[PDB]
Design a protein around this ligand. Sequence first.
Ligand SMILES: Nc1ncnc2c1ncn2[C@@H]1O[C@@H]2COP(=O)(O)O[C@H]2[C@H]1O
Ligand SMILES: Nc1ncnc2c1ncn2[C@@H]1O[C@@H]2COP(=O)(O)O[C@H]2[C@H]1O
Ligand SMILES: Nc1ncnc2c1ncn2[C@@H]1O[C@@H]2COP(=O)(O)O[C@H]2[C@H]1O
Ligand SMILES: Nc1ncnc2c1ncn2[C@@H]1O[C@@H]2COP(=O)(O)O[C@H]2[C@H]1O
Lengths: 199, 198
Amino acid sequence: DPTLEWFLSHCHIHKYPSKSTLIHQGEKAETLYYIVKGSVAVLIKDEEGKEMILSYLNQGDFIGELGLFEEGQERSAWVRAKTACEVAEISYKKFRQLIQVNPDILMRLSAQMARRLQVTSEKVGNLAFLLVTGRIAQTLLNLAKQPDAMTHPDGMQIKITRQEIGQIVGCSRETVGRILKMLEDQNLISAHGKTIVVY
Amino acid sequence: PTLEWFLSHCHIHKYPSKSTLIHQGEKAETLYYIVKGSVAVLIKDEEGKEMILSYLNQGDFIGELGLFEEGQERSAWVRAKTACEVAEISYKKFRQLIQVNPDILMRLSAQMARRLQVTSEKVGNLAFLLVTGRIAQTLLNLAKQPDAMTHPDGMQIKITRQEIGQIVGCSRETVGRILKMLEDQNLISAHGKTIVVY
Ligand SMILES: Nc1ncnc2c1ncn2[C@@H]1O[C@@H]2COP(=O)(O)O[C@H]2[C@H]1O
Ligand SMILES: Nc1ncnc2c1ncn2[C@@H]1O[C@@H]2COP(=O)(O)O[C@H]2[C@H]1O
Ligand SMILES: Nc1ncnc2c1ncn2[C@@H]1O[C@@H]2COP(=O)(O)O[C@H]2[C@H]1O
Ligand SMILES: Nc1ncnc2c1ncn2[C@@H]1O[C@@H]2COP(=O)(O)O[C@H]2[C@H]1O
């Protein structure tokens, strides 16, 4: 749309190959990003290097916004390219001028921030209230209802590794393996290889 | 100044302690601002167990999450801790104010950003730490707040075992047992409703 086209005209755009890191946790934040094309993962880590995926973000999503509103902040998480990405970037200083010219661009950003708070708060609830089986079940269901799901005779077919599931729900790949076997035993899914059919 | 201006467009109401300002699932059409008092933001499970997502205080916006897209529900319960004086304004009126001076939206968004940082950390804590570790980190977090008092042995904080339980996801009895253990390990001290984090 015209508002995003205008905003993007003020950005400089860069390509990140798959698996490259756009944002490192702890970096001093002075830059806003916007995904023109591609997908990323937002990750945090514990003291042993275990990773949890806080969110995937996709085309049309802003990234690196959390430092915009107060000076001297650090990046709160790592952001890694899941595919080749084309990403627009703009200094906080320039973005603030754009906001004065047309606050609709701040409305667009803030809308995403609000949704992220909602979704992350839901995740808190899931971790606090659900067991690992329930979190894995809900994750498989949510992934089957995503745009990139594949139609299957028996339901919706998804592509995700045990490692990635573990990183979403907070458990080892071995634990994912055991729970997935349990779910197939219950005739709720089938596991082919890296492919899972959610009935 | 800009706060004064914003408030002149609001209707201000009083809320006694324990009263619910916002109920989860209600249609969101209104923005609030805490002029005085403190609140807790809470979610519930299927068994009625409650978890505190955040405490908010004077200067905090509340009920902001439905502002940017129509037909959304309140995402959580917000309950008065102390009695509160709360400014209220329709989403429609607020959207007009933003066009006059977007600094009011910058202030609100600054809070959304902080909340996402905090809530994201909570996600990590729940995923990575056992109950003892979560209680420990909670004490550490409280010790960092502005309302924490300096003490010869560290920072003194004020919180109940029920509140800690609601924050970390465990019973008040579990909190009680673990605080005793943590004291034995020479990491904290306790006294009724007051805790010193070494
Ligand atoms: N819970 C979350 N949901 C979605 N995106 C997030 C979340 N936490 C952090 N991020 C993104 O990761 C970025 C890391 O850099 P910033 O903190 O500047 O901005 C952050 C957000 O864009
Ligand atoms: N509580 C947890 N226990 C184990 N692994 C976790 C936890 N939270 C996140 N993870 C990550 O999820 C990953 C799943 O695959 P891995 O076992 O190879 O590595 C795991 C960790 O990096
Ligand atoms: N994770 C959180 N941290 C702080 N405040 C929150 C969080 N989740 C919800 N809230 C507040 O609770 C309110 C519930 O109503 P809204 O969804 O309209 O707006 C929400 C926020 O103001
Ligand atoms: N897993 C859990 N076990 C017990 N209480 C919980 C849990 N998760 C959240 N809570 C809440 O935390 C509260 C701490 O005080 P109560 O024991 O009175 O009531 C508890 C519940 O409402």
